[PDB]
Design an enzyme around this catalytic site. Sequence first.
Site, mmCIF file in Angstrom:
data_model
loop_
_atom_site.group_PDB
_atom_site.id
_atom_site.type_symbol
_atom_site.label_atom_id
_atom_site.label_comp_id
_atom_site.label_asym_id
_atom_site.label_seq_id
_atom_site.Cartn_x
_atom_site.Cartn_y
_atom_site.Cartn_z
ATOM 1 N N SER B 438 0.813 -1.124 0.000
ATOM 2 C CA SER B 438 0.000 0.000 0.000
ATOM 3 C C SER B 438 0.905 1.251 0.000
ATOM 4 C CB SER B 438 -0.996 -0.034 1.119
ATOM 5 O OG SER B 438 -1.877 1.032 0.823
ATOM 6 N N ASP B 517 -8.469 -4.135 -6.210
ATOM 7 C CA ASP B 517 -8.192 -3.098 -5.216
ATOM 8 C C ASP B 517 -8.859 -1.780 -5.713
ATOM 9 O OD1 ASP B 517 -6.952 -1.200 -3.549
ATOM 10 O OD2 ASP B 517 -5.230 -2.606 -3.252
ATOM 11 N N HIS B 549 -7.921 -4.516 -1.528
ATOM 12 C CA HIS B 549 -7.001 -3.954 -0.586
ATOM 13 C C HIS B 549 -7.108 -4.589 0.792
ATOM 14 C CE1 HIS B 549 -4.080 -0.679 -0.343
ATOM 15 N NE2 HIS B 549 -4.436 -0.548 0.924
#
Lengths: 574, 574
Positions: B438, B517, B549
């Site tokens: 991330s 995501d 995610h």
Amino acid sequence: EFSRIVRDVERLIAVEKYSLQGVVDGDKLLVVGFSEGSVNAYLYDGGETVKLNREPINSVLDPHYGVGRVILVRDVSKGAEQHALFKVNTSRPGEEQRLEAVKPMRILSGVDTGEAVVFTGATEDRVALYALDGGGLRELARLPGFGFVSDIRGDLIAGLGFFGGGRVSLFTSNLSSGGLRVFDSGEGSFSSASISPGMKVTAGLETAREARLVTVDPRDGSVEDLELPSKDFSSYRPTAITWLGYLPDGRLAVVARREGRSAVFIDGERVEAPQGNHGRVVLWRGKLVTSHTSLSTPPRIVSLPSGEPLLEGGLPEDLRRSIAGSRLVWVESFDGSRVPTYVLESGRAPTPGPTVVLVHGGPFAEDSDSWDTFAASLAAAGFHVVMPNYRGSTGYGEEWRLKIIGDPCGGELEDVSAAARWARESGLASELYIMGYSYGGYMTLCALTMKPGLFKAGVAGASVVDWEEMYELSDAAFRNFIEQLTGGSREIMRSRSPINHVDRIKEPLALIHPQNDSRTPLKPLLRLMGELLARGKTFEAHIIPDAGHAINTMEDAVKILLPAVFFLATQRER
Amino acid sequence: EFSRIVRDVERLIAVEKYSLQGVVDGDKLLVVGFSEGSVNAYLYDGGETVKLNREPINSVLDPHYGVGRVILVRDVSKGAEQHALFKVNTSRPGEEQRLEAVKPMRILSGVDTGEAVVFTGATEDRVALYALDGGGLRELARLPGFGFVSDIRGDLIAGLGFFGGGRVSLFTSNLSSGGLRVFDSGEGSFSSASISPGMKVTAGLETAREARLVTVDPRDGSVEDLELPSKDFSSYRPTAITWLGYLPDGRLAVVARREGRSAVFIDGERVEAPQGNHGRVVLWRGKLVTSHTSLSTPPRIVSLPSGEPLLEGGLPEDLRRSIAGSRLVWVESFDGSRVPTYVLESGRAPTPGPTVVLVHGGPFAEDSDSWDTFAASLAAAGFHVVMPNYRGSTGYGEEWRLKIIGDPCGGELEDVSAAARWARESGLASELYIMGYSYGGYMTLCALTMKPGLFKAGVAGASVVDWEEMYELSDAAFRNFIEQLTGGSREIMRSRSPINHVDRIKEPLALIHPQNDSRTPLKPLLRLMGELLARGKTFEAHIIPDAGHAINTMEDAVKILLPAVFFLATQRER
Ligand SMILES: [Cl-]
């Protein structure tokens, strides 16, 4: 149980595999071996192998009997198959001298006479036949397409050419002054070649449904059938010829095959050999030697007629037990044709059980009674394996092989699909998957786009994605092969490209691709990912670093095989 | 061997992990647990757990004490975090009733009073505070950015709002009549909130380098410091406030922290708790209960003050011993700032040894004395691990946290790079890698593009690739967060995007990304792959199917983590 899988796949990849190349120096065997994690070249003599190369290679050039050096072929482009040639003197193993007169190119084949190194290679603008001697590099001829040097005797060079329509021509050239003559048979395709003591070209000829031997006189192009002293060969009725070659005592060695298993003949007489498939045959220590492989035997070097192994990688007992059987079956396809289909039964799967239609590459290749690491790994992972010789395959005659021309993603796909239906209907398969590499990965994509619902999921490795964009990125040899396969039709190039049919996909797909593949390039696969994403399709992808279409290390093989096995194992738990 | 790695990684992922959510039905604990391979919701009442949900979920809404139902939050978009809400009656576990009045949206937070469900959600065009009761769904207020409901008492709704500049405001609303009141502090950011029996809003206030408790009167916006009966809390001088909440007996529970470890206070009095970090505190059968975690303890549910475990996934001894040591160190960065950095020494690596700077996500998050599966997996794989709280991190005061605003790929990257320098100079590291997910994957890309040569190789997971393109693909909440981070500047959005600096990359890169995501979308990653390919860079990629995610199955965690460990293990063998 994915850690037991990793251990099995690794071990299957790690088992040593040997290929017999010739006889060099002082009556020493030259073998290419996958050992110690990579492809290397060795001399064998008694018990000690001696490693000739340092860094891993791809292959060696074919040496004349007893020559005192070996020419390694090595990719110097991190998988893109721009190769260079490295001389190793057999008396100083491990010392490599790069042949700098030869700029990197895709090396397709070659022979070393001891005085000249003669090879075919592809660059961006051509395919050519080259000779390198003490005077330097010379271009003997530019070729109309993929071509392979088969043999040299004196000044006469013989080879095999893919010069149009999928057909294999014979060609000759002159070592001293170059040029080219092409011999095309109206009956079929030439398959293997060797120059007789009489300076005629003995060749296998593969006709509609059969194979025979012919004699071509390169002076006038006359052809006649070759009759041999013993009739075992004739009476065997081979469908295809694997290899042939004159031994240094003048006798003709031929390896020919039918229904995925071969046999060895010397002046037409059968020589006992272990069941499966064989490669070159040489005279060593006055005894006959060949390579051998089968679905349960990794490639090894054996003596004939004994069958005693000279070089062999051992298979662990627990892995051997993973393959519960194999069979050859004939599946009926859409037009009534019978598709020869090899089947591997897993000992770790029930019947009916999860089954993978593992589609071969090429397309001019076959599933045979020959070792297949991918098929073995699937059996170890608890999948049965179905391996159909779709139209376009070798081993079943010129007519079956040529049916593919002008029809990629057509009849051959029907054959694959008929094999899938057979697996379910025959009661082997409880659920069906498709997996392949290269043309096989093409087939996965084509099945998932054109036959949604047939398979539960697919694995597409080093796939053809788009004929049109690939064509633009391909070297001279690949451009020509694309034109041949697609019949030179733009409409075929487009309609048979599965990137143009992404909306039809309904099943989970795993893409696997080496980033530096110069045959099936990564670029179109990126665009395919973009299409899958934009249309909301389920997919997974694994791109492998610093590797291409030809895998020469265990580490790269693991990276291209393990994700497929994980993906199918995960699918099976749904 | 990689197979012993698969086994340790799998076991590290597989250990059960718990989060305490509240007390429902007849004095039963409500917990979210990772167990049986996925995230589920459970009742616990002294013995075996009872599973509430059927299919995996992401979370549950915060229940009022003793309510007879639980609201599950579940992604119904195969990872894209369009969620729906599902009611489970606590007397009929396993029976779900979807709340159809609420269309799928990104559910950010919410509380269930037993009579009304109040939640914040983001769509393409808005972030809003919603209430759903017998009368149907009502939109109470539109919010200026990410907002989270913290508490409801009577008709008063209190929450926390990221309504500009990275700063956290308090907001209130009314359940019956909606509307919005926003309370800003000039000293810092509000951190957690709960409504007193007096109908004031008790909040944590995080100031430049310290934290305290304040009382906000939602009627006039007046603020004052809150004095508690016991002075342990004030004398502890926390830097940050983790959570606070009124117990049903009127006592205020606070969890606050300094230097990556927390403490628990009840009306200001310290309660003994196991060393590490704690979550919410509840009263259960008149006794105190909380969650606990540390670098060697997966999140578990314990009784206070004893520390005895109610629910705990036991870390196997052999995996425990793979972490030979930990330290908190203060890395000196480019401007003299001291970057609190947590360090794990692997028991399976020499010193100096291969070391990974494992960069946290967020950016508003911290490395603390809290369990981290990735870090444990790297130690088990024979890497030391270095985890730097770069500027932007929580836990160290408002001033450190807000330094990042307007400066992504600036100071924070220097902090990461100073951490790498420290690892080498301190004598821990023989070779250095960078890994993150991330915002951490962002940092990998930023390090490889801006600091070529500092690291041997990088792993970038669910990376930020291009602020401009991601902005255009984001929902209302993410767009706003992106503007806040980048300081609303189109120049920052472009110049701090590593897709613009691909030519600088010199080290091997492994990309890992979930296809669906919606926070860090795959689409710009595909373009990055195109760039890496066009420019001849070495890279590998793994794209995970039907995931986003927020990973909520063991199988998805293995798919996102295992390739990174394989890649680093392979790099280490060079
Ligand atoms: Cl959890």
